[PDB]
């Protein structure tokens, strides 16, 4: 409420004055305008903070606010004399001063629209779900074993390898060069996907892709650091909606290019790289904040962390988040290989993986809109809902496991959409029940450490199940083992629910 909220209530009072008639009672409106104008004259602007005071570039700011308050005087002088038609004159004078004097030293006036446009456009990667048909076609000719047991476990290890140090370098660099490195990493991933002939090329591609997969939390913290806490709720809601709309638009564009447009995979990846270049340009046109999470006190945070470790609900939902997130990430990693294994058809028109991705994103958004409306306390439906939904997920993984019929790929897609709708109903519930306990720095720390535990568990299960130096199990037996693993998890939470 230093300077920007005064301008916000000034714009709100302008909206009160403009579109409303009966200017005999806009005297209160004009005097609130005058109070917000006089309160925002010496309120230490951030652009003026880098400049020294008593400077000739500072006298323009004070002179502009002086002539603005003088125009408020000239408006209220005629507003008190019974003339009700001078409110439009006050609005035109405020428009001229907005064009001339105030906004030159203020910030950008379309930051919400620009952040929503970046969240809509940087998530458009129209060759996302078509990486696995591109790796198993006549263009590159990689087998199922080379993409199953040699490429994607290196993704599983690399997401552990770049989780902690990239985030530790991210929290210090104020989140804009991290997004620049993310855009360069998307450029590197799609160039190694294009210019790649061996297994090591796609291995390095997944190594660069792990950073882009890990920069989500970085982008959310960038939203938190750019936007004031009195503004963060609505802006974060529109930014999350813009990211979800961008992902859905990306999958719909992939279906319209592959199925409807009949675009070949090379031209598809070329247009994907074009949209990545637009994303790199939009990352170049960003605005860097000044504050960060843990680099712009600590004993109080450690005390409030130690005063919540004895909570059984926090540890219970944290361990369930770790196990369910590890299992979900393994299923999402291997489900495209499962889809190309069940239906090994070479026709690109019959490949409907992007349609399953779009339906999964849509049903996840529907179940996430209906997850914040779950105002159920922890006294009655804590463990039973967990056991039932994980039993449903175990049944869906079992249905995906023994699917061997060629024409049952639609049933396989519907089972995956039901699996995504069962998982994405759980994320806002756990996020609400855990995030509303401590401070926001402690919230980010606890969710980051829980993500690190989930990554450890995913790395261990990847080392056990799908490693060539350990057991070396075939992929159908691997999905059967995942089904047995979810069944054991369902039995454990069913015995613990009582």
């Amino acid at each position: 409420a230093d300077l920007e909220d005064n301008w916000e209530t000034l714009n709100d009072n302008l909206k009160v004055i403009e579109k409303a008639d009966n200017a005999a009672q806009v005297k209160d409106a004009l005097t609130k305008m005058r109070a917000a104008a006089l309160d925002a004259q010496k309120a230490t602007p951030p652009k003026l903070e880098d400049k020294s005071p008593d400077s000739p570039e500072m006298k323009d700011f004070r002179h502009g606010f002086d002539i603005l308050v003088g125009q408020i005087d000239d408006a209220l002088k005629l507003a008190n004399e019974g003339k009700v038609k001078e409110a439009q004159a006050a609005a035109e004078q405020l428009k001229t001063t907005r064009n001339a004097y105030i906004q030159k030293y203020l910030s950008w006036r379309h930051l919400v629209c620009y952040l929503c446009f970046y969240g809509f456009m940087a998530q458009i990667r129209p060759g996302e779900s078509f990486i696995t048909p591109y790796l198993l076609g006549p263009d590159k000719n990689f087998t199922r074993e080379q993409v199953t047991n040699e490429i994607t476990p290196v993704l599983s290890y690399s997401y552990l390898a770049v989780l902690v140090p990239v985030f530790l370098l991210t929290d210090y660099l104020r989140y804009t060069p991290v997004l620049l490195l993310q855009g360069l990493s998307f450029v590197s991933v799609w160039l190694l996907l294009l210019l790649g002939h061996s297994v090591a090329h796609m291995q390095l591609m997944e190594l660069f892709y792990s950073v882009t997969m890990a920069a989500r939390i970085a982008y959310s913290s960038y939203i938190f650091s750019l936007v004031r806490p009195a503004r963060y709720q609505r802006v974060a809601g529109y930014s999350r909606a813009a990211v979800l709309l961008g992902v859905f638009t990306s999958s719909v564009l992939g279906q319209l290019l592959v199925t409807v447009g009949r675009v070949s995979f090379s031209t598809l990846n070329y247009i994907s790289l074009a949209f990545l270049t637009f994303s790199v340009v939009l990352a170049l046109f960003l605005k860097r904040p000044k504050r960060s999470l843990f680099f712009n006190v600590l004993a109080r945070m450690l005390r409030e962390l130690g005063d919540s470790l004895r909570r059984p609900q926090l540890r219970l939902w944290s361990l369930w988040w770790v196990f369910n997130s590890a299992g979900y990430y393994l299923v999402v990693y291997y489900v495209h290989i499962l889809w190309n294994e069940v239906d090994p058809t070479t026709n690109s028109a019959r490949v409907y993986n992007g349609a399953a991705d779009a339906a999964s994103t849509l049903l996840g958004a529907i179940t996430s809109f209906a997850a914040g409306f779950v105002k159920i306390r922890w006294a009655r439906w804590s463990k039973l809902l967990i056991a039932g939904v994980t039993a449903t997920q175990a049944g869906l993984v079992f249905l995906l496991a023994h699917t061997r019929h060629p024409s049952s790929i639609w049933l396989c897609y519907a089972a995956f959409v039901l699996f995504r709708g069962s998982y994405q109903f759980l994320v806002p519930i756990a996020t609400f029940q855990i995030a509303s306990s401590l401070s926001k720095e402690l919230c980010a720390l606890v969710f980051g450490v829980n993500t690190f535990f989930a990554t450890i568990v995913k790395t261990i299960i990847t080392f056990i199940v799908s490693d060539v130096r350990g057991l070396g199990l075939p992929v159908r037996k691997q999905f059967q083992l995942y089904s047995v693993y979810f069944l054991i998890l369902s039995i454990i939470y069913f015995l613990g629910a009582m």
Partner: antibody
Amino acid sequence: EVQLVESGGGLVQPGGSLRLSCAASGFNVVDFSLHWVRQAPGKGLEWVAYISSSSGSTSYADSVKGRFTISADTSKNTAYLQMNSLRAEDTAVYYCARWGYWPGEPWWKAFDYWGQGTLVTVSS
Amino acid sequence: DIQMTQSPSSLSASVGDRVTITCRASQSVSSAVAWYQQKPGKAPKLLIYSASSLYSGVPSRFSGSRSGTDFTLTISSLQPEDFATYYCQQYLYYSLVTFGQGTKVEIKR
């Protein structure tokens, strides 16, 4: 040095008329505005009216609206507050203080150069 | 129109005591309020202007503060000359000048 002085305040009748005078010796009435401040005996200070000789902005209080009138002449260097149809509430002490124009330091300076203060009374 | 309340309406302090006179506003009036000192019978005098500055002419034993819409006058050393009635004068526009209530300080006895 500059100062203010008041005149024209004595005893009147309820419903009668009375005119005030605020002779601003020294400074002009076009570079600064003039005001009127009321103090009831036993109560505190309160505001009545003002006039700006630059353009004319005669705006009154809620208790004196439609009953009093004000006039300022830039040649005689004074201010008049002509009153009529007075009531028993007007038995008070009237002041006349300087207060400058926007912008600058003379606006942020409040009523700094007051007057001696005249005494009016209304009784039958 | 707007109001300007002033709570400690009856204070009492000896020579060499610190007093606080708060003044709560109704609306979100900016840093523009004044403080007066009226002896019984005489004229008011400007003491503090713009809620923090000291008027040219009065001694430096007076000050002020600003906490949102709560303005507070403080006195370091209470001179026996400083026993009068202190008023709270907010000024935002020409025709919105409303005063306070007045605090009459007394000698502690």
